[PDB]
Amino acid sequence: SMVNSFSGYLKLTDNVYIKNADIVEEAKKVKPTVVVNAANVYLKHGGGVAGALNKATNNAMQVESDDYIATNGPLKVGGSCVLSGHNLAKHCLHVVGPNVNKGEDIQLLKSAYENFNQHEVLLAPLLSAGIFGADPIHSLRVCVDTVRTNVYLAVFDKNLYDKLVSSFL
Ligand SMILES: O=C(O)[C@@H]1CCC[C@@H]1c1cccc2[nH]ncc12
Numbered sequence: 001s002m003v004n005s006f007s008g009y010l011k012l013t014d015n016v017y018i019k020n021a022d023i024v025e026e027a028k029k030v031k032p033t034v035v036v037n038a039a040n041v042y043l044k045h046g047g048g049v050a051g052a053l054n055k056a057t058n059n060a061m062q063v064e065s066d067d068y069i070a071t072n073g074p075l076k077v078g079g080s081c082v083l084s085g086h087n088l089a090k091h092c093l094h095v096v097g098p099n100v101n102k103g104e105d106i107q108l109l110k111s112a113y114e115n116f117n118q119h120e121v122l123l124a125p126l127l128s129a130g131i132f133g134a135d136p137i138h139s140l141r142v143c144v145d146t147v148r149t150n151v152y153l154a155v156f157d158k159n160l161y162d163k164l165v166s167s168f169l
């Protein structure tokens with residue numbers, strides 16, 4: 001009964017909010033209906049956000065994900081799937097942003113964010129940021145220009161959070 005209890009976010013637009021927070025700790029506190037994972041097409045949750053979310057589930061997310069890939073095959077870059085949220089959320093929306101460190105087309109970042117519009121409210125990281133190699137300022141731009149549903153962005157590093165907020169407007 002205290003689900004989606006987001007607290008302390010700064011409003012960027014009518015529907016995009018941001019906080020300097022650890023997304024795993026935020027998921028455990030606010031009990032969101034949906035937490036977004038920064039996934040790859042094989043749902044191999046090794047590093048960055050995906051490795052942290054999987055570790056918090058004691059590898060249950062990876063076991064479920066490997067079964068999903070055995071049944072369905074890999075996702076597309078820009079695509080997503082809904083799986084269990086385990087101890088983090090009702091659901092995990094695994095979204096595949098382009099990985100610039102693999103030379104993937106940054107133009108697929110808009111298609112990746114469009115997955116968010118299928119959910120009324122989400123706790124999310126910035127897609128294609130961090131270990132995926134895209135400029136986080138650009139990822140925030142594409143997020144605010146694409147997502148229309150209510151998205152709560154968790155940015156771990158205070159210094160990156162300050163750069164994103166300070167430069168947004
Ligand atoms: O080699 C990698 O980068 C990892 C290791 C496990 C397989 C995975 C992978 C293979 C091919 C394409 C990929 N795109 N995002 C991940 C990915």
